Amino acid sequence: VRIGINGFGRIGRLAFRRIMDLGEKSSDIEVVAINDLTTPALLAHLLKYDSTHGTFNHEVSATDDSIVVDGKKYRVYAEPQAQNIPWVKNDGVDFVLECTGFYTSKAKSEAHLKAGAKRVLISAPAGSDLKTIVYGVNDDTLTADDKIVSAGSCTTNSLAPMVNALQKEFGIEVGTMTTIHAYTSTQMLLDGPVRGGNLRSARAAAINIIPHSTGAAKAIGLVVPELNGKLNGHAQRVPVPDGSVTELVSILSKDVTADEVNEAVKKYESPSFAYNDHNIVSSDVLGMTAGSIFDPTQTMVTTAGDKQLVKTVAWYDNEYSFTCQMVRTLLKFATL
Amino acid sequence: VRIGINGFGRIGRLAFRRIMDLGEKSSDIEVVAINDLTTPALLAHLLKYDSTHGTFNHEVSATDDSIVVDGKKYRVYAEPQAQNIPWVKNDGVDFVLECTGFYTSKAKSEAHLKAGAKRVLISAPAGSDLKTIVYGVNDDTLTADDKIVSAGSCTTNSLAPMVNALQKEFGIEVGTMTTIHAYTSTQMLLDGPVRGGNLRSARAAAINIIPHSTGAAKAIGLVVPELNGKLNGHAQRVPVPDGSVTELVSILSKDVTADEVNEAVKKYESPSFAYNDHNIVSSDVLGMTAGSIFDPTQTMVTTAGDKQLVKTVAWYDNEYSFTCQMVRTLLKFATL
Amino acid sequence: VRIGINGFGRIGRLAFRRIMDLGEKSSDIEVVAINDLTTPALLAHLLKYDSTHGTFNHEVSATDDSIVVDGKKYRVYAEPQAQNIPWVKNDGVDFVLECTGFYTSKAKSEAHLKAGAKRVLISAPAGSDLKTIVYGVNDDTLTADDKIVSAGSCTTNSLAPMVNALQKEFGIEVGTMTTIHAYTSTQMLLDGPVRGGNLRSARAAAINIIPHSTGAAKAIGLVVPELNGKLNGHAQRVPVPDGSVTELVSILSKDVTADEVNEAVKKYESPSFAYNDHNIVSSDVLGMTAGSIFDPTQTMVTTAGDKQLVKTVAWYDNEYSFTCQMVRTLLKFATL
Amino acid sequence: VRIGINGFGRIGRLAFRRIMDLGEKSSDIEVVAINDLTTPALLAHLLKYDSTHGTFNHEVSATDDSIVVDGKKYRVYAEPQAQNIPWVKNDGVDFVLECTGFYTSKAKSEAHLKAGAKRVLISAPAGSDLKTIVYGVNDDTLTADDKIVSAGSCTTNSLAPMVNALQKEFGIEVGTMTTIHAYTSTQMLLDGPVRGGNLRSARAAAINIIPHSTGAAKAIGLVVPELNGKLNGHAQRVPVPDGSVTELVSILSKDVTADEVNEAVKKYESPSFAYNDHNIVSSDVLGMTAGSIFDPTQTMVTTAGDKQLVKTVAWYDNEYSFTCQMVRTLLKFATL
Ligand SMILES: NC(=O)c1ccc[n+]([C@@H]2O[C@H](COP(=O)([O-])OP(=O)(O)OC[C@H]3O[C@@H](n4cnc5c(N)ncnc54)[C@H](O)[C@@H]3O)[C@@H](O)[C@H]2O)c1
Ligand SMILES: NC(=O)c1ccc[n+]([C@@H]2O[C@H](COP(=O)([O-])OP(=O)(O)OC[C@H]3O[C@@H](n4cnc5c(N)ncnc54)[C@H](O)[C@@H]3O)[C@@H](O)[C@H]2O)c1
Ligand SMILES: NC(=O)c1ccc[n+]([C@@H]2O[C@H](COP(=O)([O-])OP(=O)(O)OC[C@H]3O[C@@H](n4cnc5c(N)ncnc54)[C@H](O)[C@@H]3O)[C@@H](O)[C@H]2O)c1
Ligand SMILES: NC(=O)c1ccc[n+]([C@@H]2O[C@H](COP(=O)([O-])OP(=O)(O)OC[C@H]3O[C@@H](n4cnc5c(N)ncnc54)[C@H](O)[C@@H]3O)[C@@H](O)[C@H]2O)c1
């Protein structure tokens, strides 16, 4: 299965890295081509050198129209409109990993199907008229039939395993989320006009706490249908370049203790959902490959009379945790 | 009323600034002397130049044993033990603003009473065997009798006005707090041994999200006695040098909407408790003089069936909001 | 003289602030209109709230097509092509302050002359076929005849007064500059494709030391003709959001001591060229109104045998120092 | 050869990491014991988790009096006075790697010789009454006779290979250095009293450009005796947590071009002195094992008439480059 990566951004590049570094374990798939808005020279440089995830342990260079890794060539295009990228005919692209941020719906990502690609996995929420898959939570809903699929967001991936565990073990009546989240490239380096015009998005990212909207909690029903309508929340964007944490405050159907909550959630531990009691901080999270890293040291159950609130917290490398999830889904997708 | 400032740190210096810049409005009080562990040369320099709060708009210099502001001299001591600072006899100190972080209890801050000072206001939580005052919430509990008093923490000051309003308007059954908080000098510049040995406190402060304990919510009953035992919470320390935000998630006794919550809390607006709907971010908070700045744009009420959670959020300049509160209490304290 | 500001970016907004806050002293000029690529709502918000320069001490709001300051209306356009902005006919614009970064040459900035504006002052180097003015150094070259003029760069303004003083007092044989410089909006928040494709410009700005090209030293002859061909240098972009410092290493025509150098440069002190011996750091520089702030504490003259190198260093608020210079030139320009 | 590490700080921990990760290549040496001011629990945690250098790929834990790596125990002491650490009798310590920053002279580091250790290598400049070794430049001066030896500073290690190459190839008449340098734990997290009382050291480190003194250039004659008295310079401390760059501006004895300079310096390439033309930035430098990484892309030779200045620039991971150098010297020291 021949993969075209649309948008060699943070996610597109890390997906390239993860696929290659899985080696044997990613045999069914291989990246064959890439599309962006820039030179092969720059794409190769950014794959090689990463300010947050370190230097790629391979030999990378460019030609006039490709990047080269360990001797193998990967074609690079600069086609702003997806139906125009000729990588099916040129490169045998079967499958698009859509990571530009500009095709986040079924309608839009049809452009790749017009281009002759067979399947698209979108690196973002892309609406409710397709499936959203969080690997480890509802990847068994995925079939070979599916043409265009969403991998959700980083926050979706951080949240779904934790709420899945809580729902199955205790039941969630209602809940509200705050994710303390790294800055991303939708934000501004310094205060100035920002695409979309949001007064907070416009503010210098690496010197402010900036409240942000997020639909991750609100849309959780696409992944965990039982919690439809039960959750909401928001984000605070803070000055780290990567590394994020999701807090959830729930009313559960049963009276619990922190220890009982921790014990129940540990039952769900997996490559997708880690359990980490080592008193870590955000920079230790970088490079972790689970989609969500539950932190039992932050669990807090607050009780007065018959009323009880349950706070549970999971870390995530918003870039790399998400990427590794996408790759898990990609590998399953391929095995179909 | 002659004030000695013990600990010319962030709080001690800003209190000096605020008192001076109130001018006429701080007539009953004047700083006469200062104690720390360092040279007058350095104390004067740090009063003048501040990386977060800008340059003090006065002429500052030092002698061999004092700082000088606009021509007036303020004696500087370097006495590690408070009962040894001779500023009562030397300088007529009546009253200590205790801001070292090293005398945060009644027993310890008795050292100043041994030194011959009459009253102490402590710039921090100092236990339950004295009063903790949040100006605008329970300063009417304060009498002339009181000898050693706590001004609570920055977080206490951020939280109490918001919960006071909620308790009086709707009633709080239970609640849990997360404050997304600037780094402070208890933290480390780079990973290394930290006083107290905490594995998270030890981590580089300006490059990590770092979970932190805080008793602000748990101890709120000292300020708002009705909420005794009803609240808990924690902190996330993030890479801003000042500027913090407190989120509270409550179960209230009544069903509310966000708009109803916002409207009710606005009734409590005061110099101590601001209401700011302008879509600000943390750097806009710097220099604000309220103890707590309610942000109605972040209000979120999440409902499923008969169950409802209410999230309310207030900003605070952890350094300067707190300082201005302390000064309000100080001015009232003096008017007694 | 009616001013249109093209590009309400960092420079355009700060120029608006500086003009207003000069009050009486900016009587000959007034901003009447603004052009950018965004909503009045956002422009008003960003004028009011600034992450680095604090909140503007005025009442700011927007209508559907203007910003409003203290009751007065300023028309806002969103015209990507300058010959299309109708602010001459609509608003009586006489004069354009060109601050978009997209018209940095005589040819391009003719677009405003086609639009019917009489004069342009460009907030950047714009070639050698017009005058470049550093106020305090060669503003006496400016006449009423001039139609399109350059105010140089921030670095030009930091460098020219220092080299002017050195050239007139000792003579410069040759010199090389390094400016340690705040990040700017030409850089990336996180590693990714950057306009122009530069492999270093592409790197995350707030987490790297990033070498950068600059022609400030090389082109100094446009401002100080005697030093034509004598200087070169570069920049290191570092993680501060504003605040910069220029080091120059010279061979001079005479043997000097640090003290002699400091004494000679102090003779040139002016509103444009400050002299500051208070051991400041970059955050103290923010808001300073001189174009260049000489720091005698950093002067170092290194001698072996008959050979001598002279290092001199000046701070600058790259945003605000430059802006205040531009405004000085603007006020002189108007007085013609 | 049994090594005690005094001061399990950034350098002490990274040296532990480097020794272990050399495996076979560090056979002659092994760390047996550690001394600091803190709990084994914390030391183990900080060895395992590093905010800048990532997670150590080993199993780390503590007992009540030791750290444990991959099953092997390393004794931990908390002895403030070095002559009191009993690790010779207890642990067979032969050799001290002195990394506390508190024993940086021959006299002081004699304390370990009183404790019964045979040799000390000090992780810092420690005066002129012993040898200072920069591996790759003058490690052939080292003998078995030497008891207490200095490994210089990070900056010394960055500078010496570059000046060695220049001196041998062209001759240096005079030169001046500026190192743009990461913040270190001598600095303050926020403005406040700093050990030693320096007005600049006192300033918040992660939000300022801060000029700093350094004797690296001035003392270079201890390593490259020919350049005695020929060099000086200083530092600018900037907000990165690690990763530094040294610029040198020289008058050379011969007229050169940039290309000739680059070509000559490349002749000196070694494990200790790297040559890197890939347009890197500071975060790419982290983890590099050379003491100095020459960057030919920054070379600039500026000529007017018969006068010429030569700017050459080398990167260094101030923590890890230095550490790997120390370990090279340690391995040679042991082979004696
Ligand atoms: N960064 C995160 O933490 C994260 C986590 C989960 C999901 N996501 C989602 O992943 C997507 C990309 O995120 P990112 O952080 O990689 O963004 P990015 O800005 O780093 O990358 C976007 C890339 O797409 C390229 N591009 C833009 N428009 C294009 C077009 N028309 N055709 C081809 N290439 C185009 C850009 O040049 C850029 O290289 C977004 O949908 C984002 O919401 C991001
Ligand atoms: N920084 C905040 O946001 C904030 C907010 C509210 C409350 N507080 C509390 O205020 C107190 C001080 O905080 P800070 O941020 O000003 O700390 P800081 O480190 O900036 O200042 C502490 C000052 O006390 C001096 N000092 C230490 N020990 C001393 C002693 N024995 N005698 C005299 N001086 C001594 C130190 O030299 C330093 O200048 C602490 O209790 C802190 O918890 C801080
Ligand atoms: N920031 C500094 O330190 C500094 C110092 C001296 C000189 N300069 C120069 O000043 C100019 C602007 O710098 P900045 O920091 O203000 O940039 P900025 O990105 O903050 O502002 C640029 C503004 O121009 C607007 N704009 C872009 N294209 C436009 C167009 N076609 N028509 C109208 N508006 C348009 C953008 O929307 C933005 O608001 C550049 O030439 C820069 O080199 C900057
Ligand atoms: N960090 C760098 O980039 C770097 C580079 C080259 C040289 N150095 C030098 O290395 C030495 C240490 O630097 P660092 O960055 O590791 O400092 P650090 O603060 O990270 O470590 C110092 C360690 O020594 C411990 N310590 C302090 N006093 C002690 C005592 N009396 N007995 C035992 N342990 C004690 C401290 O608890 C701390 O863990 C200093 O001399 C520094 O100048 C540092």
PDB file of C-alpha atoms in Angstrom, chain B residues 123-224:
ATOM      1  CA  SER B 123       2.380  37.397  52.576  1.00  0.00           C
ATOM      2  CA  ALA B 124       1.312  33.745  52.530  1.00  0.00           C
ATOM      3  CA  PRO B 125      -0.910  31.071  54.141  1.00  0.00           C
ATOM      4  CA  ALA B 126       0.327  30.687  57.711  1.00  0.00           C
ATOM      5  CA  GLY B 127      -1.998  28.084  59.251  1.00  0.00           C
ATOM      6  CA  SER B 128      -5.373  28.091  60.967  1.00  0.00           C
ATOM      7  CA  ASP B 129      -4.466  29.518  64.387  1.00  0.00           C
ATOM      8  CA  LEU B 130      -4.783  33.086  63.066  1.00  0.00           C
ATOM      9  CA  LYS B 131      -7.035  34.912  60.588  1.00  0.00           C
ATOM     10  CA  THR B 132      -6.587  34.727  56.851  1.00  0.00           C
ATOM     11  CA  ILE B 133      -7.950  37.802  55.123  1.00  0.00           C
ATOM     12  CA  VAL B 134      -8.972  38.142  51.498  1.00  0.00           C
ATOM     13  CA  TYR B 135      -9.802  41.825  51.055  1.00  0.00           C
ATOM     14  CA  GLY B 136     -13.249  42.217  49.531  1.00  0.00           C
ATOM     15  CA  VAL B 137     -14.384  38.908  51.056  1.00  0.00           C
ATOM     16  CA  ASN B 138     -13.767  38.845  54.822  1.00  0.00           C
ATOM     17  CA  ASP B 139     -11.753  41.951  55.769  1.00  0.00           C
ATOM     18  CA  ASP B 140     -14.604  42.895  58.112  1.00  0.00           C
ATOM     19  CA  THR B 141     -13.385  40.077  60.384  1.00  0.00           C
ATOM     20  CA  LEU B 142     -10.186  42.058  61.017  1.00  0.00           C
ATOM     21  CA  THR B 143      -9.802  43.977  64.308  1.00  0.00           C
ATOM     22  CA  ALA B 144      -7.119  46.107  65.975  1.00  0.00           C
ATOM     23  CA  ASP B 145      -6.637  43.248  68.465  1.00  0.00           C
ATOM     24  CA  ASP B 146      -5.088  40.953  65.846  1.00  0.00           C
ATOM     25  CA  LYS B 147      -1.291  40.719  66.109  1.00  0.00           C
ATOM     26  CA  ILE B 148      -0.250  38.248  63.404  1.00  0.00           C
ATOM     27  CA  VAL B 149      -2.464  37.877  60.295  1.00  0.00           C
ATOM     28  CA  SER B 150      -2.230  36.013  56.957  1.00  0.00           C
ATOM     29  CA  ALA B 151      -3.101  37.529  53.584  1.00  0.00           C
ATOM     30  CA  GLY B 152      -3.519  34.008  52.154  1.00  0.00           C
ATOM     31  CA  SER B 153      -1.884  33.112  48.819  1.00  0.00           C
ATOM     32  CA  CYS B 154      -2.234  34.530  45.340  1.00  0.00           C
ATOM     33  CA  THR B 155      -4.482  31.554  44.554  1.00  0.00           C
ATOM     34  CA  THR B 156      -6.594  32.110  47.683  1.00  0.00           C
ATOM     35  CA  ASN B 157      -7.132  35.694  46.562  1.00  0.00           C
ATOM     36  CA  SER B 158      -8.020  34.543  43.033  1.00  0.00           C
ATOM     37  CA  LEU B 159     -10.486  31.947  44.286  1.00  0.00           C
ATOM     38  CA  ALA B 160     -12.282  33.419  47.322  1.00  0.00           C
ATOM     39  CA  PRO B 161     -14.221  36.267  45.574  1.00  0.00           C
ATOM     40  CA  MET B 162     -15.449  33.878  42.872  1.00  0.00           C
ATOM     41  CA  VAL B 163     -16.572  31.220  45.333  1.00  0.00           C
ATOM     42  CA  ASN B 164     -18.052  33.855  47.673  1.00  0.00           C
ATOM     43  CA  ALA B 165     -20.241  35.121  44.822  1.00  0.00           C
ATOM     44  CA  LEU B 166     -21.256  31.564  43.803  1.00  0.00           C
ATOM     45  CA  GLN B 167     -21.993  30.524  47.392  1.00  0.00           C
ATOM     46  CA  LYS B 168     -24.157  33.560  48.130  1.00  0.00           C
ATOM     47  CA  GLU B 169     -26.017  33.449  44.800  1.00  0.00           C
ATOM     48  CA  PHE B 170     -26.542  29.739  44.115  1.00  0.00           C
ATOM     49  CA  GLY B 171     -24.834  27.673  46.828  1.00  0.00           C
ATOM     50  CA  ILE B 172     -21.872  25.346  46.215  1.00  0.00           C
ATOM     51  CA  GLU B 173     -22.296  21.650  47.018  1.00  0.00           C
ATOM     52  CA  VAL B 174     -18.764  20.621  46.008  1.00  0.00           C
ATOM     53  CA  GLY B 175     -16.031  21.871  43.690  1.00  0.00           C
ATOM     54  CA  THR B 176     -12.575  21.191  42.325  1.00  0.00           C
ATOM     55  CA  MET B 177      -9.984  23.749  41.189  1.00  0.00           C
ATOM     56  CA  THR B 178      -7.093  23.772  38.715  1.00  0.00           C
ATOM     57  CA  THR B 179      -4.926  26.896  38.584  1.00  0.00           C
ATOM     58  CA  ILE B 180      -2.733  27.290  35.478  1.00  0.00           C
ATOM     59  CA  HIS B 181       0.002  29.262  37.177  1.00  0.00           C
ATOM     60  CA  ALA B 182       3.196  31.183  36.361  1.00  0.00           C
ATOM     61  CA  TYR B 183       6.492  29.749  37.562  1.00  0.00           C
ATOM     62  CA  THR B 184       7.817  31.109  40.880  1.00  0.00           C
ATOM     63  CA  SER B 185      11.141  31.140  42.687  1.00  0.00           C
ATOM     64  CA  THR B 186      10.344  27.910  44.551  1.00  0.00           C
ATOM     65  CA  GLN B 187      10.950  26.191  41.198  1.00  0.00           C
ATOM     66  CA  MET B 188      14.221  25.367  39.419  1.00  0.00           C
ATOM     67  CA  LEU B 189      15.723  27.165  36.439  1.00  0.00           C
ATOM     68  CA  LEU B 190      17.142  23.816  35.243  1.00  0.00           C
ATOM     69  CA  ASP B 191      16.560  20.280  36.534  1.00  0.00           C
ATOM     70  CA  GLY B 192      18.419  19.825  39.807  1.00  0.00           C
ATOM     71  CA  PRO B 193      18.136  19.316  43.603  1.00  0.00           C
ATOM     72  CA  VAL B 194      15.374  21.551  44.969  1.00  0.00           C
ATOM     73  CA  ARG B 195      14.726  22.489  48.607  1.00  0.00           C
ATOM     74  CA  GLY B 196      12.228  19.963  49.976  1.00  0.00           C
ATOM     75  CA  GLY B 197      13.222  17.301  47.444  1.00  0.00           C
ATOM     76  CA  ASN B 198       9.980  17.230  45.389  1.00  0.00           C
ATOM     77  CA  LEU B 199      10.482  15.317  42.117  1.00  0.00           C
ATOM     78  CA  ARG B 200       8.390  17.797  40.143  1.00  0.00           C
ATOM     79  CA  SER B 201       9.571  21.020  41.822  1.00  0.00           C
ATOM     80  CA  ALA B 202      13.045  19.891  40.771  1.00  0.00           C
ATOM     81  CA  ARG B 203      12.288  20.235  37.045  1.00  0.00           C
ATOM     82  CA  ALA B 204      13.323  23.097  34.732  1.00  0.00           C
ATOM     83  CA  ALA B 205      10.514  25.645  35.172  1.00  0.00           C
ATOM     84  CA  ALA B 206      10.531  27.593  31.914  1.00  0.00           C
ATOM     85  CA  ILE B 207      10.388  24.526  29.640  1.00  0.00           C
ATOM     86  CA  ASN B 208       7.808  22.235  31.367  1.00  0.00           C
ATOM     87  CA  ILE B 209       4.159  21.907  32.338  1.00  0.00           C
ATOM     88  CA  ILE B 210       4.643  20.863  35.971  1.00  0.00           C
ATOM     89  CA  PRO B 211       1.769  19.622  38.234  1.00  0.00           C
ATOM     90  CA  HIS B 212       1.936  21.209  41.704  1.00  0.00           C
ATOM     91  CA  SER B 213       0.097  20.774  45.017  1.00  0.00           C
ATOM     92  CA  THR B 214      -1.842  23.701  46.451  1.00  0.00           C
ATOM     93  CA  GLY B 215      -4.003  23.960  49.571  1.00  0.00           C
ATOM     94  CA  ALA B 216      -5.844  27.111  48.380  1.00  0.00           C
ATOM     95  CA  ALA B 217      -9.124  25.329  47.638  1.00  0.00           C
ATOM     96  CA  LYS B 218      -8.877  22.929  50.572  1.00  0.00           C
ATOM     97  CA  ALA B 219      -8.290  25.751  53.100  1.00  0.00           C
ATOM     98  CA  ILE B 220     -10.886  28.129  51.629  1.00  0.00           C
ATOM     99  CA  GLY B 221     -13.022  27.690  54.778  1.00  0.00           C
ATOM    100  CA  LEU B 222     -10.676  30.029  56.662  1.00  0.00           C
ATOM    101  CA  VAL B 223     -11.895  32.823  54.396  1.00  0.00           C
ATOM    102  CA  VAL B 224     -15.392  31.618  53.388  1.00  0.00           C
TER     103      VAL B 224
END
